[PDB]
């Protein structure tokens, strides 16, 4: 035994499953219709909505 | 709304599995000798230009003055080709051996292998093999051209041993996750005439450089009016320690040896990359010609 | 093939509808995504989209700044898209006050890592540098998404605002007082081949010169002291190989009257810049003169 | 600063000197960047001292 | 003594790393690769004196 101790620390990760309660009409989101943008390539004209 | 394309047919009865083999080569670069509107399959790629007698840089020179189309769509009985224009962006599949990233300047190169390879399972015919040029980035292409130039510089005294280990040091080249090996320009202990002309023109312009400019700046020293030309002869004397029609012949020889160097002293960037697809198979890039 | 299809008027995209509308109107359906006007369709400028860590996105929240990637002999961080102002610490052109100013906003690890990689090479700068264009919209992530433009103008979405190129005043340089109708812009990197330093000077020249040779003969006439330093360093140290005294590449072209002085504010370090209002990027290769 | 043509010697002179670039040995400016230029002339000889005990006698 | 302490610790040499990849490693880089098999999961520890 040498002349000092070792206080080791270690983190531990646990996958878990929350439950959320919230009252009626907590936040009131406002949305609009989705707009479409084009993005030209030669072969694959992607569209972002 | 039909676009400006190039139609290309086939002469041989190609099967359906060959069509499925071909439709993986959508966004592949294809050279054409002359921009027609219709073209047979004997003028599609490098197998009409490949030559055992002349050297490899002749394939670059006969790739310098081409038109580099793109395969638009593979269908029955005809192959669509889309000739690019300067400014519009396209998609090129990474037919080369080396990975691409964002923003590289891309140059076109003849392939450094012909005949047997593990990745040369290209479209074959009876005598025809469609072979694509290589699309490698700019500093790698300049490195390959410089390595080939100094390896053709040692073709005369290959019999020694330190130059041998220097050559097999030179023949290997490492790039970004690509252990790369070029072939040797000396086969059966005689160099081909194209490399001989290239390095001979290089040695010619270097020898006229060592021969003429001492006399020329010694004449220009009497017409001195500045300082940037009066110490260049001084550094010439630092390193160093006829008929005038022969001098005209020396200047004209120097300039034609300059003009016989444009295949190797420079190259034009052809593509530069905007985006690269994941797993690096294709990468959408603009054209720049 | 008749006398009507060729004699028809050429097709305008502003007359007919989109692809999605003429697709869904044939099958008679309607969905929530309104597709009657596709955005970014009349965007002739070529965009791009890069990722950049938060150490380099300072002076980039406002749109419009030159964006250069650099080469590094490493494997994973091999390319780093640094701003033009990140080059401003390394220029011998820049003054003292803005040098200590804009370094005090470039405090993160990646910025000083770029500053280290700009001086930890045996080579010179320009062979490791390639240009990418100008940024027009940032997204404020942790690795912020940003939309660079390779070729074309610099405008906001729906083209309700034309963004501008911002270059700081000490890097700005003109070579004539009679500025012509158009003046192209050029990225000039000139080296100063002194003994204790190979620290270059950075200039973003604006000039009305188009042809190359009539630019380089006045470039040698304006930077002849740098050529004197170059031939000095070639003449005092043999077995040392120099290259590319000055490097010039084409950056684009402007309209020659919208050049007005201005300032960009970010974390209240106001920095005097030069504003090219409606500038269209047009990249070119790094040409090297002697 | 000593001068032999007129035997008028100046004793206390402020000089701000610095290394100029491109293997610059030494250049001696004034307080106003005047680059005083006495050491061109044949009539002078000059002695320079540092804030340390380093010492230059200049012809 | 560094060679002996690397032999006694199990960790091998720093393999004469490139002078530019030190800036890489201080910028941030994953170095230690995976093991051959893991029937438990990812490891975690630390130490204090």
From TrEMBL, chain A:
Superkingdom of the organism of origin: Viruses
Lineage: Viruses, Duplodnaviria, Heunggongvirae, Peploviricota, Herviviricetes
Protein encoded by which gene: UL86
Protein name, UniProt field: Major capsid protein
TrEMBL record, chain B:
Swiss-Prot/TrEMBL keywords: Capsid protein, Host nucleus, Virion
GO molecular function terms attached to this record: structural molecule activity
Any Pfam family: Herpes_V23
InterPro entries according to UniProt: Herpes_capsid_2
GO CC terms: viral capsid
Protein name: Capsid triplex subunit 2
UniProtKB/TrEMBL annotation, chain C:
Keyword presence, tRNA-binding: no
Cellular component annotations (GO), alphabetically ordered: viral capsid
Gene Ontology biological-process annotations: viral capsid assembly
Pfam families, sorted: Herpes_VP19C
Keywords per UniProt: Capsid protein, Host nucleus, Virion
GO MF annotation terms: DNA binding
Origin superkingdom: Viruses
First and last residue of the signal peptide: none
Alphabetical list of InterPro entries matching this protein: Herpes_1
HAMAP family referenced in this protein's UniProt entry, alphabetically: HSV_TRX1
The protein, known as: Capsid triplex subunit 1
Species whose genome carries this gene: Human cytomegalovirus
Taxonomy of the source species: Viruses, Duplodnaviria, Heunggongvirae, Peploviricota, Herviviricetes
